[PDB]
Design a protein around this ligand. Structure first.
Ligand code: TYD
Ligand code: TYD
Lengths: 396, 396
């Protein structure tokens, strides 16, 4: 009954929750256009969607290095607008003659998303792979706050670039109303129980939780031979250039009654770690969902995708936040008592060893992890998202 | 001519900026009721207002301890409501028979403010002694994020109490709408230029900047006989139980080309510092406003009052934040290049000494500070506040 456009940027965290949703909507006779770049085109086409390529900077940008350049975060902010503009121009060109009935856009390209919907006079849907935002809670604000950057709107060049962009595309919305625009429908990839201030989000928000595959394109992983409890250890895909962290982890678990699956996420080359104990392994990539299924503890920097996949299986958590983008999750896990949180420096090998053992042996924590798993399960998934999408089409 | 009620709580930072404003309205003939507790009654009467006492909990509470109690911040949050409720009941008791034409309330007692405005069906005005909040920026969220506490609306007992309070008081305004309510007029004691995301604030907000007196009731001060550049050092009135800080600073400035004036703020006894060099003073209280007039550098934790009082006199800053509450102001001062910031531990006497000398000798920084001084002067202060109120009073 529809041609659905998904507006997104080139990032694992933002695309992976989307895949099984695409496959479900397509299963129901809908047709999907998907904005993406580079190697992401491959899994996106496999989910059933037609790929609309665009030129991305962020795809091979070094996050740590970008946020390091200057002390106000001008470089991050301006790259943000560029990625949005690059996405806006490429989608319009491709689909100006094939107008979608429904524009769905991730938080990141939300400027391009609003402008596209306005340009075509089409209903819109927002997708959140992290925490959702409303009048009470802004995932964006405490992003700025924690990151230490300048407010984007306090940055004259950013503000003017945006004002000229809205003006050009004639969107009848002011810069501030645009930046703080709440969409009529929002698909969020966490349970409401986990969402910060989740009790405050109304009907416009649908908390469907993690949506995932076997994800064979991230490789495959098979239960070990030593039959030791399995600990997943990963720093994600973004701020993951930390051979020190991984090497110290391998050392601490050397001879310990655990089997460690280490995930480098594309930065550190396994070889750069040197030799690992027999109970410790390291990959550029393995499907977290595949390790976590057989796992006992999950050690993660706090990436949402990894947290929700771990909680899906009721795995006690050890969160090792190394960057700002992940701190709200880590704060939320700590306050829900879903695991131990070792922020930055504190996440050394030895401390990480005591934490892994501690949370694996805590009956009260395990009581909370099991219950939360229950909310994740009773959360929609790809099926409930597609339902919302189809009900939304109806009202339009 | 009117009866103006000022709803406030027993706190120096929240009451000081209000005083000269009261005196102006009264001077113009209006009659002012002022909600306060304890020893603040004296200065408030002086300003020319009629004191409405309420039983206060925060007036004799130790912030550091209160926030140290538990890991979620349940004790602070619940005290916050009690303070609000205690203020609600007292004022209602006193003014039910003497309804005000206008209800002016500070951010803190904003819940009691809204309910009183609704009860009596009167226009209301909000007062912000720190940054103001709107749809783009929330000082509150910034606070919770920085303090590491749970969102108050994620805390059942807190929201239930709030919900019931709103219901029992007839207010037809949901808990979340209530919490994120934007008043139709806001007096903000900050220049819009300093305000975070100032450009995003509309005409509902009037940035009148600092409003102060001789403040003789805080004692007096005559510049030294040694004729050294005077440096004001102060950790404020809230998280100021830090003898090590003042002790180490006095030690560092020993025999240095500066005259250090330290204010303990009713916490540490001056005697507990022990012997001080001839060029270092220590007081329970002296009017920052009088030191700052003769000063060369202001060293402060980031209290909004001290900051604005210093910028009023174009004084270079060394910001030494030791607590979440002054963290956004330290961030802002740093972004505007108005001074050096030495967060928490970084703030030893030796590093403080270099900073003081450094900010005093930076031509660029001084250009920026002198310019901000310009904005503070343009703000309009007490006169402009009464102007706004009177216009609001006539419109409604
Ligand atoms: C690094 C890595 C991530 N993932 C998945 C898990 C998450 O759903 C998603 C995003 O990674 P995540 O760890 O959440 O990191 P980031 O903070 O960078 O987004 O990618 C893997 O499956 N295998 C891997 O090796
Ligand atoms: C401690 C102290 C404060 N003040 C004034 C300056 C401010 O306007 C007001 C509040 O103090 P401030 O320094 O801003 O601290 P806080 O963050 O704790 O509120 O008190 C004095 O005049 N003298 C003093 O000795």
């Amino acid at each position: 009954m529809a041609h659905l456009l998904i507006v997104n940027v080139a990032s694992h965290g933002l695309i992976l929750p989307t895949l099984t949703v695409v496959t479900e909507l397509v299963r129901r006779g809908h047709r999907v256009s998907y904005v993406t770049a580079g190697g992401f085109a491959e899994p996106v086409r496999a989910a059933g969607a037609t790929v609309v390529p665009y030129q991305s900077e962020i795809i091979d940008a070094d996050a740590a290095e970008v946020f390091g350049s200057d002390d106000l975060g001008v470089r991050p902010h301006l790259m943000y607008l560029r990625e949005n503009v690059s996405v806006l121009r490429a989608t319009a060109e491709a689909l100006d003659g094939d107008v979608p009935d429904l524009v769905l856009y991730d938080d990141f390209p939300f400027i391009a998303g609003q402008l596209l919907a306005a340009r075509w006079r089409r209903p819109a849907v927002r997708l959140s792979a992290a925490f959702a935002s409303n009048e009470h809670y802004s995932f964006s604000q405490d992003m700025v706050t924690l990151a230490g950057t300048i407010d984007p709107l306090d940055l004259p060049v950013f503000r003017d670039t945006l004002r000229d962009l809205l003006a050009e595309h004639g969107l009848s919305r002011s810069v501030v109303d645009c930046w703080n625009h709440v969409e009529q429908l929002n698909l969020v990839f966490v349970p409401k129980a986990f969402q910060i201030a989740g009790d405050t989000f109304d009907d416009r928000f649908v908390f469907v939780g993690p949506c995932f595959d076997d994800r064979r394109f991230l490789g495959e992983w098979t239960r070990p031979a030593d039959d030791l409890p399995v600990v997943l250890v990963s720093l994600g895909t973004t701020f993951n250039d930390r051979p020190g962290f991984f090497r110290d982890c391998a050392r601490a678990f050397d001879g310990q009654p655990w089997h460690v699956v280490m995930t480098l996420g594309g930065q550190v080359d396994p070889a750069a770690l040197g030799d690992l104990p027999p109970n410790v392994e390291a990959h550029r990539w393995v499907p977290h969902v595949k390790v976590l299924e057989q796992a006992t503890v999950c050690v993660t920097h706090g990436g949402m995708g990894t947290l929700m996949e771990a909680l899906y299986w009721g795995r006690p958590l050890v969160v090792v936040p190394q960057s700002f983008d992940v701190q709200p999750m880590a704060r939320r896990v700590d306050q829900l008592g879903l695991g131990a949180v070792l922020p930055g420096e504190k996440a050394d090998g030895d401390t990480l060893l005591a934490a892994v053992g501690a949370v694996a042996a805590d009956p009260a924590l395990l009581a909370r992890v099991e219950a939360m798993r229950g909310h994740v399960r009773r959360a929609g998934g790809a099926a409930r998202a597609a339902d919302a999408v189809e009900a939304y089409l109806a009202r339009a």
